[PDB]
């Protein structure tokens, strides 16, 4: 870490603290993540998954037996973007461009069999050019919020799929549109039960195999599903339709990233630029 001057704390994950930092030699500004042999090998495969919609891992410094990840630096995240836009909301054309770009990112990682596992507005980073990028991709495998967790994770599936990322990104899409979190659980059972209340308690009709999942209980209350027009107004039909498919209970029915890219909602995509105050 001797090659860097820490200019400020950009945040604190479960893994460790992130710092905005300046390369003493190059003067490139980067985000420096302090973490805390298999983890080494996994992290080094991440150095090779490069895409415009993935925050670039620049370097990996294993020294004195600590681990530092040097990332491409961006000035804002979508969480901060949202709180800033809450009065008027993010315009639909920009919401739509953000979703499209993230889906692109996901389609890439997913085709290389890498999952994110922990998508949330704080790890979605934006720039002045209207780009949006996925941060912390692949780090969960390498080693607090439940709001974006897929139901098969909550029900105790150990072997879950890329579908878990589509679920989280659905939850985020709805949050951009409405300016409220979709399913703000403050425990595992609260999170599961908020999902049930909105989408209906899942059963064998909608999700074959559900009743045999590890933490499924026949004693779960039986709530009826709500209409989507009540969940995310004033989103149009194409958008509700797509959101519906990203929030399918059965991971095997849930839309893939690559198929979501083809949905009619994206017919008139554009790439607006946000007004960001840095
Ligand atoms: C977390 C991870 C990577 C990052 N790059 N820029 C800001 C930031 C935050």
Swiss-Prot record:
Names of the cofactor(s): Mg(2+)
Binding site for Mg(2+): 123, 136
Coiled coil residues, start to end: none
GO-annotated molecular function: ATP binding; cyclin binding; cyclin-dependent protein kinase activity; cyclin-dependent protein serine/threonine kinase activity; magnesium ion binding; protein domain specific binding; protein serine kinase activity; protein serine/threonine kinase activity
Domain Protein kinase: 4-266
SMART domains documented for this protein: S_TKc
Function: Serine/threonine-protein kinase involved in the control of the cell cycle; essential for meiosis, but dispensable for mitosis. Phosphorylates CABLES1, CTNNB1, CDK2AP2, ERCC6, NBN, USP37, p53/TP53, NPM1, CDK7, RB1, BRCA2, MYC, NPAT, EZH2. Triggers duplication of centrosomes and DNA.
Subunit architecture: Found in a complex with CABLES1, CCNA1 and CCNE1. Interacts with CABLES1. Interacts with UHRF2. Part of a complex consisting of UHRF2, CDK2 and CCNE1. Interacts with the Speedy/Ringo proteins SPDYA and SPDYC. Interaction with SPDYA promotes kinase activation via a conformation change that alleviates obstruction of the substrate-binding cleft by the T-loop. Found in a complex with both SPDYA and CDKN1B/KIP1. Binds to RB1 and CDK7.
Name by which UniProt lists this protein: Cyclin-dependent kinase 2
């Amino acid at each position: 870490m001797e090659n860097f001057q820490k200019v400020e704390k950009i945040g604190e994950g479960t893994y460790g603290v992130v710092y905005k930092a300046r390369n003493k030699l190059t003067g490139e500004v980067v985000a420096l993540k302090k973490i805390r042999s298999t983890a080494i090998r996994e992290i080094s495969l991440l150095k090779e998954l490069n895409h415009p919609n993935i925050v670039k891992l620049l370097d990996v410094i294993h020294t004195e037996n600590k681990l530092y990840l040097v990332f491409e630096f961006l000035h804002q995240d979508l969480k901060k973007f949202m709180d800033a836009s809450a009065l008027t909301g993010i315009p639909l054309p920009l919401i739509k461009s953000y979703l499209f770009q993230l889906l692109q990112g996901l389609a890439f990682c997913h085709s290389h069999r890498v999952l994110h596992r922990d998508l949330k507005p704080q790890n979605l980073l934006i720039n002045t050019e209207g780009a949006i990028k996925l941060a912390d991709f692949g780090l969960a495998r390498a080693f607090v919020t439940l709001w974006y967790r897929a139901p098969e994770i909550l029900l105790g599936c150990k072997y879950y799929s890329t579908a878990v990322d589509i679920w989280s990104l659905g939850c985020i899409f709805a949050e951009m549109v409405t300016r409220r979190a979709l399913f703000p659980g403050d425990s595992e059972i609260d999170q599961l039960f908020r999902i049930f209340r909105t989408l209906g308690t899942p059963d064998e009709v909608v999700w074959p195999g559900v009743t045999s999942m590890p933490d499924y209980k026949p004693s779960f209350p039986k709530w009826a599903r709500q209409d989507f027009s009540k969940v995310v107004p004033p989103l149009d039909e194409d958008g509700r339709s797509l959101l519906s498919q990203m929030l399918h209970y059965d991971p095997n029915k849930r839309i893939s990233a690559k198929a979501a890219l083809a949905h009619p909602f994206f017919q008139d995509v554009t790439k607006p630029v946000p007004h960001l105050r840095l």
